[PDB]
Amino acid sequence: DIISVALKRHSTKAFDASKKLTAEEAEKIKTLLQYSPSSTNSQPWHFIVASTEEGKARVAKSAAGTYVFNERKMLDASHVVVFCAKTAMDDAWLERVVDQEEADGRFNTPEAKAANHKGRTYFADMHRVDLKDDDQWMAKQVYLNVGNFLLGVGAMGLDAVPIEGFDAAILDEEFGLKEKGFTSLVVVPVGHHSVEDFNATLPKSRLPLSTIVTEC
Template structure:
């Protein structure tokens, strides 16, 4: 399948069959997420990969009792940094210098730009910016899953505060923003599986100027 065929194939599966996704497919999806675009390359978010069945059972009622939570092979939790701190920026600068084999001092101007952005925003503004960055990676994950012929259901319907408490995300400086169960569709029990994909007409969706 090419990318358009893969996107035509994918949909938000309402039921999954519990079949395990091969580890190589999961790793390619995760690597695509890691390589996703991010403003200034900072990647102010973390992806948790949950396979533990008991933990998924605990998450299901927090996520409006959506069955895909338990029926999935892997549950990805996208969690944004709850603030952008000088220590996080310093760690990023040191890592960038190491990867690019240059002195960190050469990145001082770039570091100061990042510090300036973080310092002039409130903590909530920084979190909201981080959450938007997480959504970019989230979208890449959806596309990557489709190219691997793995079903993925985007979810915002969950109690973020309760999930953060369960996963102790606040202790890690994180707040959950979205969920992505990975698995395989249960076409016989999913009312949406056989229905055509509905998207806005191109002439109404695209404005050419």
Template sequence: MMDIIQKLEWRYAVKKFDPAKKLTAAQLDRLTTATRLSASSYGLQPYKVLIVENPAIRERLRAASWNQPQITDASQLVVFARVSDLNESHVDDYTNNIAATRNINPEDLAGFAGVMKGTVNRLDAAGAAAWTSKQAYLALGTLLTAAAAEGIDACPIEGFDAAQYDEILGLKDKGLATVVIAAIGFRAEEDTMQYAKKVRKPIAEFVEVI
């Protein structure tokens, strides 16, 4: 079995997926579970993960993604959408979840809730958009790593019209806004990029110990 370094060497941003190969329900569940466990500031998770399988919707999304074939050929398309109306109610929902999960009194979380609300209230619209987007990207990184660990291919994609995605998926009415997407599935044999050596900065240039 490959170790994590070998698996990360194996992964790449797939350019051509095999449309005949689909994730099993168990594989998809493992990826979504891993993504749910991703790091997030305070643990707040101010974003939602959408798994798009509907072929007709994906055709429309492909048109909003400069006709990139991964959008329709992959097993699933994963859309990371940030909360567009971040406010104190999201903190309240989270602290209630903590209290229920850990069986503690919500009043004992008042101090923690106050810190989070202070952060939320200090952010203007642009700051909130940037902060919530960063949280979504943390989850994207977890998805890509988990996929590699499971031998599942993925391709993170930023080349798309976010406004069109929001319209097609009806996100505005849900208080969400598209941040980034990823196609998941299995590489096609004819995707020649799988045979190319991975190119990254040398470790001595990439890392500096201070």
């Protein structure tokens, strides 16, 4: 049951540094990242997956100053995922997307690919040209990917914590992501909680359905 997963999953505060993902688990987490939906199948994202001790330490440099209370969550977890959004929607990306969809067998005629390209360009152009918000639109898709990921890892029986408390300017410099066209948004350390994770045994808390839902 997925609902039991939803009620049991928690934001891990401390990871066991001796528990690592299997090679099968490492492959499956990467499948989850790749297969999330996105508006127009635009997939405007890049992911850093750090599993080495050198790589996690480099990600862990961004939990500087005020974000030092999240550094140990990055170093003790098995795999650390960095979710990055594209910084602008370019026309090369859109043609990369429609060429992948043709290569995957989604179009039956050249008119069906041209129709799909036109339709995606129009909605990319509403954000790029009309609203001037393509940066915010692509970042919103990366957060939907985070949502998908947290539930999926929970359903695999693993522990994780979504981190917004890190320095994105520090992280983007280290991996040289502005040169590559991307910016870091959320860091998700993945592994197994330890006995020091105080949040594992505390109750879940959410606003009641009376406040947050309207039925019509």
